Amino acid sequence: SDMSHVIITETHSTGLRLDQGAGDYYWSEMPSRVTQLHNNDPNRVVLTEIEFSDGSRHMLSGMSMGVGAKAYGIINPQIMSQGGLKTQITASADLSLDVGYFNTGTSGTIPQKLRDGTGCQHMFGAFSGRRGFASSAMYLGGAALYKSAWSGSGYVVADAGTLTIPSDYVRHPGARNFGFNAIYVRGRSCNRVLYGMEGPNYTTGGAVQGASSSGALNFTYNPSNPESPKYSVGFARADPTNYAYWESMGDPNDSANGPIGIYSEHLGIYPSKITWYVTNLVYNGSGYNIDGGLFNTSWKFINFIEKADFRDVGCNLSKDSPSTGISGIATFGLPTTESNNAPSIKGGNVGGLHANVVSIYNPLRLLGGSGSTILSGNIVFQGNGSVHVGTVGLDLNSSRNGAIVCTMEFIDDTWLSAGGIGCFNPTEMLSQGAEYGDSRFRIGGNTINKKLHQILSLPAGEYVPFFTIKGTVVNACKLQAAAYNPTPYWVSGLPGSVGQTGYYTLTYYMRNDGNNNISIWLDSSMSNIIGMKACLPNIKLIIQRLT
Amino acid sequence: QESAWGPAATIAARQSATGTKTDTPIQKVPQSISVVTAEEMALHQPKSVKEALSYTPGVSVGTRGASNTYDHLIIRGFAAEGQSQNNYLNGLKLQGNFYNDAVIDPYMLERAEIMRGPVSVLYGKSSPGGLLNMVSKRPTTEPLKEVQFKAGTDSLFQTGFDFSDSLDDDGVYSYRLTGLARSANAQQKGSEEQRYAIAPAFTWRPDDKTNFTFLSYFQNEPETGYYGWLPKEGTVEPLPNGKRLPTDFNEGAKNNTYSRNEKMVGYSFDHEFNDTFTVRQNLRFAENKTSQNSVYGYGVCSDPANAYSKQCAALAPADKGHYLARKYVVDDEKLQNFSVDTQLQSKFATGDIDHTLLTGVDFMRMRNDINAWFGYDDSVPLLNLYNPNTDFDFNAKDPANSGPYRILNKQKQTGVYVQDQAQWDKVLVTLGGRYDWADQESLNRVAGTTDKRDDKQFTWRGGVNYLFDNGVTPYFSYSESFEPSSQVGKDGNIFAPSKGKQYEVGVKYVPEDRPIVVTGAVYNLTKTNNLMADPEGSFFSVEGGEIRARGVEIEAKAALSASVNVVGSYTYTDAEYTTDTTYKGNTPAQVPKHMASLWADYTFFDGPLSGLTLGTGGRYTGSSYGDPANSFKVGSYTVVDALVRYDLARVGMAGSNVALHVNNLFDREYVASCFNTYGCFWGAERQVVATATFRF
């Protein structure tokens, strides 16, 4: 009774529905207790299990991101300079599935309701230029959109001279302060919305057209002096299912600017039920406290059986090598468990994966200790490569298998820059080299509590993914003309003023070294991208053993 | 007795091939035209063709100030497209692209005629403002053996020669060899100028009807001098401490270089079959190369153009006013130009009307391969203007703040024109037209992208002259022009050509018994389809702009006595952006409202001072706006030039003379012009030149 047993105190379930115009967003209103726990008691570890129509069940784990970005840098030395950036970022509360939370009170359909939920697309845009000789004002928009301390291209913009986004204007999947009361889940990945290459037009109202928008902010510097450079920076949350763009700044679906689309890798599985396993684990800033379930009816236990009455649930993935063997979009299959407790991987294109499963039956007590680290910094990748990035100081030999409770506490909104291309100033790449700039989106001080709790096993020596970022980017050219020379940001060149499409996948792995340490590994896989700057998402990882 | 430049200015300067492509007296030309002869240029000794036109109306010859790199002219408030030079040599365009513009030394020239207003009816695509036509020195009937020496201020040294003779004894074969080697220090410290030019010419004249002259001109300029920009803070207006930059300020790097090489060969052939049919053909092939490593200023750090530059940002807000932001350009160009112009002149009578029908075919082709690298913002370290220059690494081409410009420009123009000068008693109507097929092709070698546009344009000119027996010749003409655009819009297509139309009413006083040439003209010249800024939040250009220029030009040449010759001119210019997204209603930069110039020289023909010529002159430039926004204004100035010339004929050397030229006699420190707040040019300092010409 005193040994800090981890027990599931209460269980709640809901049936998903494709109602209210939700085409592929299987949604449901959360049970009142689940909503109260998710919002007003975020320290309590609640496990979320998705059950699919084929009978496979998966326990939500990790985080994932979806980036769609475009940028161009045309210039003519005698006439003008003009540049633009546009990035759409989606996030999910799962590594492979598209999971998020929203309010049923918001107007519109479910996709339009997502404009105020965690499933929205965070749209950032900058447009700049200057009419004059030898102008470099193509990069002024990038200098305004991103906060960078790096000494490079001439333009630097002060905080008062650009737009800063308050922390409450963005929607993290684990945000607990917005009072979400509904959940959605898809058997797909986050939408990588690839549309548009420019921010708001400074001669217009800056309105957002297309998708239902909310939280729209924009800054405009439009002096009456014709010699001054002009730039505009905009932000808006939009419905993830539609193309969102600023007024008079739409995307031409032409060769110079690359393709358009909404990209999401399907998994071949369709959700049908969601279960919440409320446990007695209470996160306390540094570790976890066993509170409740003291030694009853409907009191499930959790265990990691090392291979009938047990309900096995696939929790996390394990691979022997951090490299995915892919160059471009690397999709991890979903670790599920069939109706007969048989682990399997559903979908994806990464090989060598193993499905780790949990056992829920009606032990695995807390083991004293725990440890934490903050994944902070910038990693520069010049191709496909895996880099050791972190370490959490705890010994996993005492734990039953590698069972742990993991909490990713996001201190600030650096997660919005956790991606590569599109999450930093593309002018960082122009000064070729291993320069480690800190270019990031100008988000304000933190006021939103962002936590994700998961339980997962770390096999000895194997790599466990817990944070993926998928990005579809286009190094665009505004137009195809000899008069204006486009800037190659992350490609060798634009061989015909044709937009060069690129793909990448950043994955963070948690490896049980066995030398009383947990190492953190960041892996990158690129296609048609010469270099990238990954920003560590400032994630505080809290890990506690389970035995 | 009278001097050589006397009759030259008032008699020899009355014939004009330019403006009609036929040898027509100026009073019979329906358009304003000014002629400067070799004798006038011998007297004044202009440093370039620009200074030769210092006493003609409607042209702004010194907007660039002390710089001598190009012979750029602003005629009637207008310049060529791309701020190029609309200069013609021997009736064929000296076509240039980008920085590859050719200049002809005035010592190699026999005449310089400037046509004012549209002349596209004869010369194809051209600026609305006008045209400068230079005539190369031709072999002389009589022998010529002239050597010239110059020793001026700023370490100026020029040695030149001009030899002409007849190979045979009758005169069918004759040649001419004109050369000069010029070395000087530029006004701006650390800049020098070197020029070597030679002009071999050869005339084959089997008889009086036929004439074939081979014209060549080879020029080498290891250093062309200063071509930089200076801020208006420090030149027009005081620096924050209350001082001004010295007139010899050089904002460039120590290793700033600027080279030019010119090689042109051609011929001028005319032949008269009979009194009815005459044929003329002008041909020239030119190969010009330009190289350059230039660091140039781009206004102070407090200029709006440098609003967010990192280097200016790190300065204290007080210090931002006296730090000069700078950029650089590294350029290497190779231009190939070929032009041939064939004319058939027909003379016939239709009853009581005398017809001079000119039918011509003109072909031009240009190619320019540019290999440039441009420094953008923060590509050059800031320069402190309070300091009492070092090297620059032109090869460290950082892609963060610089970029390539590798362009192959191709141009082609074919034109067929018909002109009719029908004369009835005293009325002479001039009706002409021309059809052009200008094609342009531009290839971006960095991205392998091509821009191409073919233009079909028709321009016509119509003028009437009434020839009073008093010499008074009232006239009026309407002239059209076109100039194909080089920019592209949002869709990547080259714009339609801009067009210039002009109504001009004038009076010419060219008496037949007196040495006086007085001409006046009032004009209304409009350039429609001008390119302007996008009003819809884009930085591309759009069509639809319009600039209108009205004004009055008065020019007077007279020989009041056999000893006194007076050349004067006055100009009133009203240039205004009639339609434009910005600058609407503004006056274009570097265009003064009033310009005046007066010259007078006195020659002693008797007494102890016999053979001495005293010359003096003064050019006034009114205030002009320093930028298209008309934010600030460049003040007026008056520059006085003196001249002392002594004919060495009495001392024993006939034809020889020694002269002493002082330009800017009162050493006025003035800003010549500014095209924007960051590009300003100092006027030339006082220059004293002693020159000796010996005729053997």
Ligand SMILES: CCCCCCCCCCCC(=O)O[C@H](CCCCCCCCCCC)CC(=O)N[C@H]1[C@H](OC[C@H]2O[C@H](OP(=O)([O-])[O-])[C@H](NC(=O)C[C@H](O)CCCCCCCCCC)[C@@H](OC(=O)C[C@@H](O)CCCCCCCCCCC)[C@@H]2O)O[C@H](CO[C@]2(C(=O)O)C[C@@H](O[C@]3(C(=O)O)C[C@@H](O)[C@@H](O)[C@@H]([C@H](O)CO)O3)[C@@H](O)[C@@H]([C@H](O)CO)O2)[C@@H](OP(=O)([O-])[O-])[C@@H]1OC(=O)CCOC(=O)CCCCCCCC
């Ligand atoms: C008897 C009475 C007079 C009778 C007078 C009659 C003359 C009439 C001539 C009209 C035609 C014309 O205009 O003739 C010009 C000028 C020639 C001089 C003329 C006489 C002057 C003076 C006249 C005489 C005065 C008295 C030729 C020219 O300009 N050529 C330059 C050339 O560029 C133009 C080319 O394209 C054009 O068309 P485009 O494709 O662009 O659309 C042309 N077509 C036209 O015009 C058609 C036109 O519209 C039709 C209408 C005609 C109207 C006629 C009516 C009127 C008739 C009047 C009656 C085409 O001409 C021709 O096709 C031939 C023919 O037309 C000329 C033959 C007759 C004239 C000569 C005898 C001379 C006559 C006899 C005189 C003795 C030409 O080839 O580039 C070369 C360099 O190439 C590279 C290099 O590798 O670097 C590679 C290249 O790449 C490429 C590549 O792109 O090529 C691609 C790659 O994939 C790869 O394949 C790579 C390959 O590896 C490479 O093989 O080539 C590229 O990258 C470039 C890069 O752009 C760098 O800029 O660089 C230059 O070499 P450089 O610079 O390195 O040395 C070269 O300059 C040099 O030759 C010029 C040398 O001067 C001297 O000799 C002058 C000496 C004079 C005598 C001295 C005084 C005597 C006392």
Ligand SMILES: CCCCCCCCCC[N+](C)(C)[O-]
């Ligand atoms: C003549 C075309 C020039 C295009 C670029 C203009 C800016 C650079 C000018 C440099 N400089 C002042 C030396 O001419």
